[PDB]
Amino acid sequence: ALEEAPWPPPEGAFVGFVLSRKEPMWADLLALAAARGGRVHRAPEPYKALRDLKEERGLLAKDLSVLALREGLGLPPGDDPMLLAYLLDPSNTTPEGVARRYGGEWTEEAGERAALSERLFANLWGRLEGEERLLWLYREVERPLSAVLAHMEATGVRLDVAYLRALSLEVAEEIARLEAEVFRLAGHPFNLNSRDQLERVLFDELGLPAIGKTEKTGKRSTSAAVLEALREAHPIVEKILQYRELTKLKSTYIDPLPDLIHPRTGRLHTRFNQTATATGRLSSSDPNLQNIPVRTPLGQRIRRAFIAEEGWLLVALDYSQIELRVLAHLSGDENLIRVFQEGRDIHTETASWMFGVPREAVDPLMRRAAKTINFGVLYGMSAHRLSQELAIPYEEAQAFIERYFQSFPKVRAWIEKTLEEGRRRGYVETLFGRRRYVPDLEARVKSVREAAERMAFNMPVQGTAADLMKLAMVKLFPRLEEMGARMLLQVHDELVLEAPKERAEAVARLAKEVMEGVYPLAVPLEVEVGIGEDWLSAK
DNA sequence: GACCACGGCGCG
DNA sequence: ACCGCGCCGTGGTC
Numbered sequence: 001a002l003e004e005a006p007w008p009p010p011e012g013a014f015v016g017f018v019l020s021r022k023e024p025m026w027a028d029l030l031a032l033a034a035a036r037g038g039r040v041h042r043a044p045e046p047y048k049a050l051r052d053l054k055e056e057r058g059l060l061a062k063d064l065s066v067l068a069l070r071e072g073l074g075l076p077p078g079d080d081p082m083l084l085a086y087l088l089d090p091s092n093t094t095p096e097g098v099a100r101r102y103g104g105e106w107t108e109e110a111g112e113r114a115a116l117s118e119r120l121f122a123n124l125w126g127r128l129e130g131e132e133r134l135l136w137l138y139r140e141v142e143r144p145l146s147a148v149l150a151h152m153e154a155t156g157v158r159l160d161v162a163y164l165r166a167l168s169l170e171v172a173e174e175i176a177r178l179e180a181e182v183f184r185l186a187g188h189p190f191n192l193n194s195r196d197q198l199e200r201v202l203f204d205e206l207g208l209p210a211i212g213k214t215e216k217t218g219k220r221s222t223s224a225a226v227l228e229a230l231r232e233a234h235p236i237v238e239k240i241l242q243y244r245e246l247t248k249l250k251s252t253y254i255d256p257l258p259d260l261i262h263p264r265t266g267r268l269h270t271r272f273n274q275t276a277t278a279t280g281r282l283s284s285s286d287p288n289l290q291n292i293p294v295r296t297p298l299g300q301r302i303r304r305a306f307i308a309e310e311g312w313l314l315v316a317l318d319y320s321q322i323e324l325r326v327l328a329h330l331s332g333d334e335n336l337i338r339v340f341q342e343g344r345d346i347h348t349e350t351a352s353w354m355f356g357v358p359r360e361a362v363d364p365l366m367r368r369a370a371k372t373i374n375f376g377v378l379y380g381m382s383a384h385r386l387s388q389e390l391a392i393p394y395e396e397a398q399a400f401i402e403r404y405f406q407s408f409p410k411v412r413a414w415i416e417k418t419l420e421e422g423r424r425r426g427y428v429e430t431l432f433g434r435r436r437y438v439p440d441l442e443a444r445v446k447s448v449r450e451a452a453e454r455m456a457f458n459m460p461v462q463g464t465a466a467d468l469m470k471l472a473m474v475k476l477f478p479r480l481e482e483m484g485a486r487m488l489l490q491v492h493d494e495l496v497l498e499a500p501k502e503r504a505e506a507v508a509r510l511a512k513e514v515m516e517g518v519y520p521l522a523v524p525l526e527v528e529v530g531i532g533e534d535w536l537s538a539k
Numbered sequence: 540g541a542c543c544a545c546g547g548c549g550c551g
Numbered sequence: 552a553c554c555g556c557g558c559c560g561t562g563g564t565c
């Protein structure tokens with residue numbers, strides 16, 4: 001039923017392509033084809049063939065669009081059945097699965113991929129018939145967003161290589177003094193990177209009490225949390241905690257990053273995965289630039305490596321207390337809506353409490369602590385873990401949790417109602433109707449069920465914030481194009497932009513406004529904005 | 540080499 | 552009994 005026609009495909013045909021590797025910015029275009037009508041076209045020269053296309057329609061349209069941009073073209077991404085499946089069920093995350101579930105087999109040949117893209121789109125599209133809300137999200141948010149993401153990926157971000165190179169040599173020396181001392185206290189050397197070897201040393205060789213176990217294998221956990229609880233039991237503990245921090249940092253960022261600079265761009269090119277999350281957020285991959293350090297002194301030295309091009313400035317915008325604002329609007333709780341209507345900051349008020357100091361003295365590292373407290377309690381962390389976290393009696397943590405919800409009566413009300421419709425309907429949804437299926441809401445094992453419930457009621461909050469950031473990006477992007485400013489990174493409720501110094505100021509004001517006005521809620525959405533030569537100073 | 544399950548831990 | 556991610560060594564295949 002499928003015929004083979006000469007390269008030149010009509011228009012509106014679905015593309016099919018094969019890369020040497022999964023990273024669009026580094027891949028080699030091994031093959032390019034197209035499917036339309038009932039015919040399939042294979043281009044003898046892919047790189048040559050790109051120029052022919054006016055749009056990228058089909059499985060993973062964005063990635064090919066990113067490669068096209070890398071080659072100087074301007075092939076923008078269009079329809080993509082992955083986006084439709086993902087909207088149908090966010091568990092639809094890979095072509096292999098989407099293909100197996102909606103009508104085909106994901107292979108390694110571009111003709112078959114072009115053919116697959118067309119039929120998949122037809123099937124998935126039909127099943128979105130009647131889903132006005134999911135269609136609204138398709139055409140208004142996702143499809144356009146892919147274009148935004150493609151440009152972000154090909155643009156990349158600049159990095160201070162020589163800076164990280166010298167940092168490595170420094171931290172290496174500190175790592176040395178650390179392992180060296182750990183070994184002395186243990187009375188002998190061993191692979192400190194080995195959790196199993198460390199386990200034996202701490203729990204068998206030394207007689208430190210075990211605090212928790214690991215999940216799948218039930219071993220005695222050597223986790224940071226376990227170690228913090230053991231800091232005073234032996235002088236070796238602190239040392240290990242510091243060894244842990246530095247090695248994590250050097251092995252994950254300080255060393256790998258400088259080797260990831262692209263030859264032709266001199267910049268770092270992360271990928272932005274559009275269908276990799278259950279709640280609707282994005283994920284950053286291969287270089288994951290959504291998890292660059294910032295919470296510790298060494299972490300900050302590292303963030304400092306992200307810099308703007310000479311003559312430019314980075315501009316970072318981040319929604320203030322995003323999820324608490326989203327929650328006030330979902331639950332409709334008046335005591336909470338007032339909190340924002342009155343300009344209050346809950347992370348500040350919590351951290352002020354925690355550390356017995358006036359708001360005025362709360363620093364960033366104290367606030368971050370307040371966040372895991374605030375977000376922890378809301379999303380159901382037990383008094384036991386909380387007591388540990390706040391370093392206070394068990395009943396004091398029990399009381400903290402009692403007051404929190406008593407303070408915002410409609411939150412619990414909203415939770416229970418979200419959970420109930422979740423059971424009946426099989427899924428929960430976001431403000432815009434992004435849905436997530438949670439079948440285990442009716443598991444008969446309390447353990448499994450209550451865990452599904454937590455996943456379930458967090459989705460609407462975290463998912464709504466995600467929709468908001470995505471819509472904001474769709475609206476902001478064209479405006480930035482016009483101002484000659486570029487959009488570099490999205491970090492969940494944060495955007496990192498690069499703007500010519502003459503225009504940094506104007507860009508900062510435009511972005512802030514677009515972001516705060518994205519979609520008016522029962523509470524205003526404030527955006528803290530910063531500008532600097534690097535990502536750290538930016539915030 | 541290339542890929543994995545785990546335990547861990549970076550960020551949101 | 553916080554939620555959502557991806558990446559890095561170990562210890563182990565194949």
Ligand SMILES: Nc1nc2c(ncn2[C@H]2CC[C@@H](COP(=O)(O)OP(=O)(O)OP(=O)(O)O)O2)c(=O)[nH]1
Nearest residue numbers: 318319320321322323371372375379492493551554
């Ligand atoms: N459950 C949970 N959600 C979190 C946690 N950290 C962040 N989030 C969610 C809620 C906020 C959202 C974005 O994170 P940010 O670091 O931007 O924090 P934020 O809450 O927006 O606040 P802010 O603007 O004051 O920094 O991600 C956490 O530890 N637990």
Ligand SMILES: [Mg+2]
Nearest residue numbers: 318319320493
């Ligand atoms: Mg924020």
Ligand SMILES: [Mg+2]
Nearest residue numbers: 318491493494
């Ligand atoms: Mg943020």
